[PDB]
Amino acid sequence: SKVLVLKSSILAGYSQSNQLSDYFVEQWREKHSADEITVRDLAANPIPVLDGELVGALTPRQQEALALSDELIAELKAHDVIVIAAPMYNFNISTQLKNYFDLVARAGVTFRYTENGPEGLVTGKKAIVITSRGGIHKDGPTDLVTPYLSTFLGFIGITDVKFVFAEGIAYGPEMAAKAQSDAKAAIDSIVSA
Amino acid sequence: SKVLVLKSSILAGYSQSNQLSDYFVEQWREKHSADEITVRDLAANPIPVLDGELVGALTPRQQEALALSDELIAELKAHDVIVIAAPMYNFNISTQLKNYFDLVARAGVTFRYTENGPEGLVTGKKAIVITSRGGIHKDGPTDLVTPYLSTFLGFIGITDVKFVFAEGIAYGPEMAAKAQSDAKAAIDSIVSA
Numbered sequence: 001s002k003v004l005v006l007k008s009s010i011l012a013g014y015s016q017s018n019q020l021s022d023y024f025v026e027q028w029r030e031k032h033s034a035d036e037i038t039v040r041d042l043a044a045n046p047i048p049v050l051d052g053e054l055v056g057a058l059t060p061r062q063q064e065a066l067a068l069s070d071e072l073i074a075e076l077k078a079h080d081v082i083v084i085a086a087p088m089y090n091f092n093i094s095t096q097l098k099n100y101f102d103l104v105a106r107a108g109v110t111f112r113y114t115e116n117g118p119e120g121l122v123t124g125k126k127a128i129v130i131t132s133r134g135g136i137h138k139d140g141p142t143d144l145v146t147p148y149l150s151t152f153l154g155f156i157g158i159t160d161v162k163f164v165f166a167e168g169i170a171y172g173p174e175m176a177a178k179a180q181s182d183a184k185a186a187i188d189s190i191v192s193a
Numbered sequence: 194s195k196v197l198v199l200k201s202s203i204l205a206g207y208s209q210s211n212q213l214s215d216y217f218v219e220q221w222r223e224k225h226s227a228d229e230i231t232v233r234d235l236a237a238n239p240i241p242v243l244d245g246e247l248v249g250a251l252t253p254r255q256q257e258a259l260a261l262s263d264e265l266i267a268e269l270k271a272h273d274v275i276v277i278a279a280p281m282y283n284f285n286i287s288t289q290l291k292n293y294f295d296l297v298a299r300a301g302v303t304f305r306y307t308e309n310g311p312e313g314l315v316t317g318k319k320a321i322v323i324t325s326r327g328g329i330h331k332d333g334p335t336d337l338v339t340p341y342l343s344t345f346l347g348f349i350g351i352t353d354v355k356f357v358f359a360e361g362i363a364y365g366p367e368m369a370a371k372a373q374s375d376a377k378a379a380i381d382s383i384v385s386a
């Protein structure tokens with residue numbers, strides 16, 4: 001099997017979600033050792049903002065963007081397990097992750113319109129979302145990130161999604177420790193499945 | 194009173210939300226004619242992506258970004274009625290609007306931490322969200338944009354928010370007409386209040 005890991009934090013080596021993603025990769029290498037793992041850091045290697053010119057896809061800029069979209073989509077379709085690091089910034093996902101989504105959602109490519117509604121074309125995937133927050137939002141009205149990810153990933157065909165939460169990072173060393181340890185335990189559950 | 198209008202579509206003159214925002218401005222000029230109106234187009238004059246360097250705010254780049262944040266925040270606080278055009282792209286708001294939000298949310302400036310929780314510092318505002326969608330999501334599970342806007346605006350102090358929907362734009366000329374006419378009627382209700 002092939003694992004794709006998508007990093008999206010702007011906090012680099014101090015990122016909670018990157019730390020957890022790195023733990024996931026270490027554990028996967030140990031316990032599913034046949035598997036190939038690809039790590040794409042959407043902060044280290046940013047994806048452009050979808051603007052009028054890019055959606056309008058040609059200008060050299062439009063051709064580059066189309067090529068990139070194509071690369072990202074081919075990479076997504078080429079992996080079996082998709083790990084998405086989704087830190088919350090201002091009640092949204094990071095813009096780094098969003099830009100990725102805006103180039104991967106493409107009619108006729110990652111979803112198609114049918115008589116019954118749109119249907120996703122990225123099928124047979126298993127996703128794991130590692131989502132870090134300073135506060136505590138899980139199962140509450142201020143967590144729009146979780147249902148949005150479920151909705152967006154479902155739309156492109158990725159309906160099997162497991163969420164790993166690291167919440168309360170901002171509430172002191174103990175709460176932060178608890179967030180890390182609970183997330184690592186959830187990851188270990190998944191890895192050993 | 195002073196009106197701030199924030200445009201965020203990438204579709205320029207073909208934007209449904211910009212058309213509706215322009216209708217709002219025309220009607221406000223007619224019916225609340227003392228009032229000053231400022232229009233900021235976040236697509237025509239884009240706000241940078243919040244990245245590690247910008248949040249880390251100094252480098253010339255950090256100083257520029259801080260100055261811009263300051264300008265945007267002062268403009269927000271200087272207006273009484275805030276009209277936010279919020280087209281939905283891939284189940285999110287536009288990145289153009291998001292970048293704006295990422296520079297306006299600032300501890301000690303647009304919200305403060307208190308014993309009782311964070312509290313918004315942008316007070317006494319009335320907001321109108323004009324939100325356009327190709328499909329139909331209102332009061333359903335795939336509308337995360339609405340609660341996210343309520344949540345984000347509430348966090349900075351803007352708790353009085355009225356939503357104007359233009360849905361089903363993608364479902365033919367009649368549905369699109371209905372979206373426009375229903376949104377214009379809602380706008381007329383607000384304007385005549």
Ligand SMILES: Cc1cc2nc3c(=O)[nH]c(=O)nc-3n(C[C@H](O)[C@H](O)[C@H](O)COP(=O)(O)O)c2cc1C
Nearest residue numbers: 009011015016017087088089090091132133134135
């Ligand atoms: C720009 C910025 C905005 C943030 N806004 C939120 C917020 O809306 N909700 C919250 O619970 N935490 C907020 N936080 C805290 C982050 O969620 C927390 O630091 C988390 O660990 C981020 O993941 P990371 O360390 O992988 O980047 C914010 C942090 C940053 C840098």
Ligand SMILES: Cc1cc2nc3c(=O)[nH]c(=O)nc-3n(C[C@H](O)[C@H](O)[C@H](O)COP(=O)(O)O)c2cc1C
Nearest residue numbers: 202204208209210280281282283284325326327328
């Ligand atoms: C990049 C892109 C993504 C879109 N994704 C969605 C979607 O998630 N939900 C939906 O209902 N409509 C979707 N649409 C349709 C827009 O919501 C619709 O065209 C609306 O009129 C946009 O407002 P605007 O004309 O002001 O830009 C999308 C349109 C674009 C350009």
